[PDB]
């Protein structure tokens, strides 16, 4: 029973995802620059206030 | 097993059971009324409804295919943004064993085939509508699946630098630095790559690196 | 053993007998083994107060008319292959002319022997398996190889004179197609669904035209070859397809006059001013010659395997694959007699070239049936 | 403690005599990668620089490298040329 | 009112023309000195004919084309020495089914010249008896019976339309089966052996065909390619409407 | 009109129906209007009744709807699945939740019958029935009757004067007869088997010297029966013509020298077809082992008639050297990528070795977690000599669990429990844990091993085992043996598939209260404690400290289920000054596979084990650490522990205390004599051998073909003591004589449950003698 009368509404238990290191850029010395990324893997600046973790419910609205 | 009924009660008991939480008797319901009525109002109702079931009831691969169906049939319906999250929910929930993580074993050096796919999605859904209600949680899951590949290719580059092919680990940190230069991974890794311009004697390249980690020590 | 891992198809059951008349067997002699399921034409002949038939293993008997007595027997087993003990498999239409009998095989060999003494006079190779009754005429044997390639093979000494090149389609139905020769030119259908006339003494086609449906509903199965054999008569040429035209065209090279949707692989007979015909789903037909107008069907036969009707004392006698003989009147399609001559079935044609009427079982002997 | 196996170990890209000798200062890049193949590794981080490293090392009977630098301009024009047969730093 | 009698393919026959039908050749015969037997039997007939007009009107008029209705009040003035608008559109009927039908049956049949063929009349009423494309459940056979009796009581004196309208199946049992005036060389060839004996005041006996047992009897004693082309339209047509007739599907509502 | 009153509208919308009609509310009506709308009605292709009634109040009309197509079954589709059925119903349009058209249906069986034409099967049948349901609904179902596949009759070759056609016909795939013993196919023609056949053919005529050789045409015939299939081949085969020489050209890249020894061949021996096939392959095969992975090899032959001779032409063209930019793996779930990418030979950044990457992939099936391994190389999009490596992996269920009790004629319960893993949560450790706690025994063992402790891949391993054999409840005259023992084992590998392994290891063993037992006081007696044969109180102690060593040789396909190969296991352990005990005592297994087809199916296994153990000097090999044959895993059809000889019992006053009628051994109101028991004490030398017929299932299809095994097994064993004494007794059997080869027949299934691997056996011992306790049936789980 996956509802278990508390998880009727809401994504699976584990919620590791909440804590992560946030991603800080590596700082250009002088006489060399950073090879140039490629924009595949990158997120872009979004509000925020929406709900995440257990808060956001998942089902057909 | 299910009866010959019209929708209305049919799918009324079907909303009943799912709301008890029993998901068999849903599934099932939802199933047969799929087959039953593939052409009625609703039929939008009752796939958005199978995508939920699938997914709580650890269905995952027959949840993946419905939910494929549903965005291809429906390319331009009003909450597509909730598929889309539900897809790419699904696939990083692929990822996990549940019983691996019982002991505590680390799951980043495993086969990130679904991991790459959960990120595809989520940054699908975090282009396409900025103004929805799962855009927080979207880009948190898009940074923790970022770090998880990181982790994955520095591990990698630390085999083949126990290992002693030197080459490999310079084009593999190379890699990293071009595709995730912002993850912890990337800072842990340039040691890596300083020792294995150091092996093949071209100091001259490894004096590069030296600055770029002396300039971000702090 | 796959009979049990078949199921079971519906055939119609054979109808009322009301025996009008019961013939009775001559001589039921015995002449081989049997051909067995094994679709060919080797229907027995009969000339000169003589009959002469073969078996599929390469036995050839000739046998006496008016009893069951037994002139002579020959075998003709390739005695000089790699193990000089094949079977020849024999499958030409057992032809007489003269003092000679024709014979083909499924080995490109056709034999010609000697009368009243079974000695070979000469064999021949031909341009694939001959599948066809030879047939006589102007000094020449046609045959219808199953590869499109009709050849005339000299009567005197056996070689070819020429040879045509017939089309072939890719799942063709079975080939037995018998040329027709009136004037000095051949009439022959190929496997494609072409009715081809041919100068015989020169070895150059004369016409073409081509008898056959449209592609139908389904391009699998649904052939359109014409392996009848075509029949000469008044300066006209009568002709059947297997979906279906029976076509009559003028034979100096004019055009149909008529045609009807009607399909057959049996042989069809010409007779005063009618047509008698069996086709697909074993239904017995007569027509009229003047404009193709049906004139009765009798088809509560069905399914049953029938073989080439053939005439005999102004009624038809239908062969079946279950062993019985039927009769029916020439008018009306009215059922006249059934006879169980046998259980072994027919497969070829009837031969009444005088007043008997020989019928040779596929799995079986062969049978002399009276009035 | 050195009668382990150990699988020889290749990571160069296979320089020979005949193909270091046909490459002469002043060609471009097109031609220069048509003569010996595509670099596995170059600088990411300053400039245009070309390394064709030869690693061989067979079981534990020592470690072989020939390295060769090449060095480009904006255009695409092979500014400098330097090889290295064995390891210097002995 | 107007309940659907009979389903055909799409189309459908209605009550109402099945009445104007009724109406219209009633008074046709009473204006041609004619009887009519029991109405039950002109209401089956009426209904089959019209059952009949819509299976061959379904391949045609959603295909083909239309008539041009100037050309069609032309020839309805000429012809001629209730609503104006129903009687154009019976007659608009009958003459894009007569072309359709027409067009049908010159396709199927082809005339080389007659130059290789080289090269009197007759008043006479033409009964019918339709048969199926397989009568192997002995259909001949009952009517063969039917032909007999029909045959008898011909020779009894009763008026032949009745017997015409009683179990006809060509277009003209309305008008008692009449064909108008044919040629000896412009019947079909199942009727020639049958003309050579045949006399003035008697009647022919059935004879067997594909289509039918065909009663012929005799009420009244460039040319050749349409007398034989007369012949042929006249046999394709009857075997061509026996086809269309059998591959359909018909649902009769009572 | 005022109103419009419906009877009968349940599916279809009262708007869209009144838009349907020309007249609606408001409209003037008469005759022609109606009419016109009634064909309207049915000009939409809705309705199959409609019909107006005559009502004063303003109009009335009822509506009959055409049903809906509830659910369809298709009863006696006996060899069409049902998935592609309802796929062609859609095709014309007959999908649940339209309605049911009346006139469509014989098109629609029409259409059911087409689709039967490709399988096989041409006089079918097929019925529709139309079951009424309420909600105006219907139930369709399909009856199908498939009359008859397509036989062939007879394949027919025409033209040839060098072999015969049935030895032709013998290697086709459409068998025209089949057998009347053997039935392991049908008679049915299908359009895809026959260019292979033809190929087959082709290749037939082709490899024996005919060159001009060719297929003129064929033909597929149709008895007009719609049953029967002849087939027709037509053939030129030629002339024989010989083979002189090989003038291979082209872009050697440096390798003229063994590629023309590869080449080599003596003129004279006639023209091959399959040859040049090989050397094709042969010559691409060792171009791709120096680098060159795509190059494009030709083969022309030049043919003169003067001396019917021919010349082969080989053009050779070797592209750029292909390097490898980074080799990933898929598939691996549960294995992390240092598991996989451990054992392999070519690595990234280097020019790519076509025979190291195929040892890359032998290495993987050979690890032995691992169900299938495809290799795939896959070209850089945007570079001409880059390349990628990827290796499809698909998980195994690795690990086994051991369970079961044995309660057999009112025995003591024994809860003994095992888990082995093999691979541990995908870190490559090796984990297994084993043993039961009970009143009177406890075992305890626990093994670890890290294969790859180091890079090259030295093995580290521990064991510790703790096992008090008591067999004590109250009484004291039980044979107590408490012993615990730990060992240390690491190894290393030398040159290819060969390991070599050595280890430490410390066993205390203690025995107390043993019953009478020659062998026993044999041991006893060479460390000459003198015991008294009186009475059961003795005391034992001792303190090995051994050396163990070993070597392993291991090259053979699969790691489990093997194909192909053989295995070696040699393991010895020998005793070192310091100890109790001073012996040494050797063990050999091998396990060999012979393929017999070329896909690798039918199998020959050959087994055989070996074992010998003998005293240092003076002393003796103790007798619980012998050898024992029997059982499940060594010879089947025996009970565990049977084969070898059997203990004599000693009869004495405290040998058995006789309490009510028990204890009835070597009792001495019970015996008075030295006697015979069925107690089989184990040898110092073993011998056992095995041969097995490994065939494919015959109760399951090919999807799961390497899940279970079937095996006809025939084994061969003894057990024998060196340090034996004949005339020491009388006319007691001299168990020193290495002949009573016990024998035994039968067979054997293999199956992975997701608990391990069962086995199940039935064997009947073909040779018997006295005190070998036989047991037919077998199951284990290992």
Known sequence: CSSDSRYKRQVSGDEAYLEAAPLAELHAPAGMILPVTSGDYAIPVTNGSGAVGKALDIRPP | EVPDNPPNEIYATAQQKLQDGNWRQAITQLEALDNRYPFGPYSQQVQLDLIYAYYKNADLPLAQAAIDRFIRLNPTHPNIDYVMYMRGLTNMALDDSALQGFFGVDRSDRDPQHARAAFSDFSKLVRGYPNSQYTTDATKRLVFLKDRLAKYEYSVAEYYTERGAWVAVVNRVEGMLRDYPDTQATRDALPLMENAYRQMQMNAQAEKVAKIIAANSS | LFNSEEDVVKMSPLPTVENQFTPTTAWSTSVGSGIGNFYSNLHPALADNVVYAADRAGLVKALNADDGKEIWSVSLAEKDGWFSKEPALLSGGVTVSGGHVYIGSEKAQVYALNTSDGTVAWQTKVAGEALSRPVVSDGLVLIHTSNGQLQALNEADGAVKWTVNLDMPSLSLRGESAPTTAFGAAVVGGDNGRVSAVLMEQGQMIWQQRISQATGSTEIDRLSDVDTTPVVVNGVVFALAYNGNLTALDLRSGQIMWKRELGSVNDFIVDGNRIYLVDQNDRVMALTIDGGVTLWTQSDLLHRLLTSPVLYNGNLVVGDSEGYLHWINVEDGRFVAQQKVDSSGFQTEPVAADGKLLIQAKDGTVYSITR | ?90 | VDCVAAVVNNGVVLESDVDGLMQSVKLNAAQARQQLPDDATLRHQIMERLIMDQIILQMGQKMGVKISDEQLDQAIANIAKLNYNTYRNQIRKEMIISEVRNNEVRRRITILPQEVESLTELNLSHILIPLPENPTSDQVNEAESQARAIVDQARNGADFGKLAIAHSADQQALNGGQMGWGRIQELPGIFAQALSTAKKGDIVGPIRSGVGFHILKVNDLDRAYRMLMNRKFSEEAASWMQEQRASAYVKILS | VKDIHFEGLQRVAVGAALLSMPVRTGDTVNDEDISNTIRALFATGNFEDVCVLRDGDTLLVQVKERPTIASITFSGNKSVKDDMLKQNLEASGVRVGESLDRTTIADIEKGLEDFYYSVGKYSASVKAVVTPLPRNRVDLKLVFQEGVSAEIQQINIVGNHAFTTDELISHFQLRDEVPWWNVVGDRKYQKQKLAGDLETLRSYYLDRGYARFNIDSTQVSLTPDKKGIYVTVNITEGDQYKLSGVEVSGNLAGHSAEIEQLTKIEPGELYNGTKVTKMEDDIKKLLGRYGYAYPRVQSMPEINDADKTVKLRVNVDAGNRFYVRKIRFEGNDTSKDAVLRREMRQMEGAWLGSDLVDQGKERLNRLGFFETVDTDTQRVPGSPDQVDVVYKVKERNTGSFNFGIGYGTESGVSFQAGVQQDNWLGTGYAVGINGTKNDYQTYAELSVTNPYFTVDGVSLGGRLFYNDFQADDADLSDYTNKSYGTDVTLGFPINEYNSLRAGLGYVHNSLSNMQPQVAMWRYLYSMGEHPSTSDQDNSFKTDDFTFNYGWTYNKLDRGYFPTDGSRVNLTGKVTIPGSDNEYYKVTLDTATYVPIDDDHKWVVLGRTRWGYGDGLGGKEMPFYENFYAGGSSTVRGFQSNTIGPKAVYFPHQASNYDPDYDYECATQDGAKDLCKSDDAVGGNAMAVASLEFITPTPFISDKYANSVRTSFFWDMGTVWDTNWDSSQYSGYPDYSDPSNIRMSAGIALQWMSPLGPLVFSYAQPFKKYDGDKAEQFQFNIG
């Open chain 4, 1 to 90: 403690e050195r009668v382990v196996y150990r699988p020889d170990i290749n990571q160069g890209n296979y320089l020979t005599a005949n193909d270091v000798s046909k490459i002469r200062v002043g060609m471009t890049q097109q031609q220069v990668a048509y003569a010996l193949g595509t670099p596995l590794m170059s600088d990411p981080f300053g400039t245009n620089t070309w390394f064709y490293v030869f690693r061989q090392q067979p079981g534990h009977e020592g470690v072989t490298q020939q390295t060769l630098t090449l060095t480009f301009n904006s255009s695409g024009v092979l500014t400098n040329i330097d090889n290295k047969p064995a390891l210097s730093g002995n």
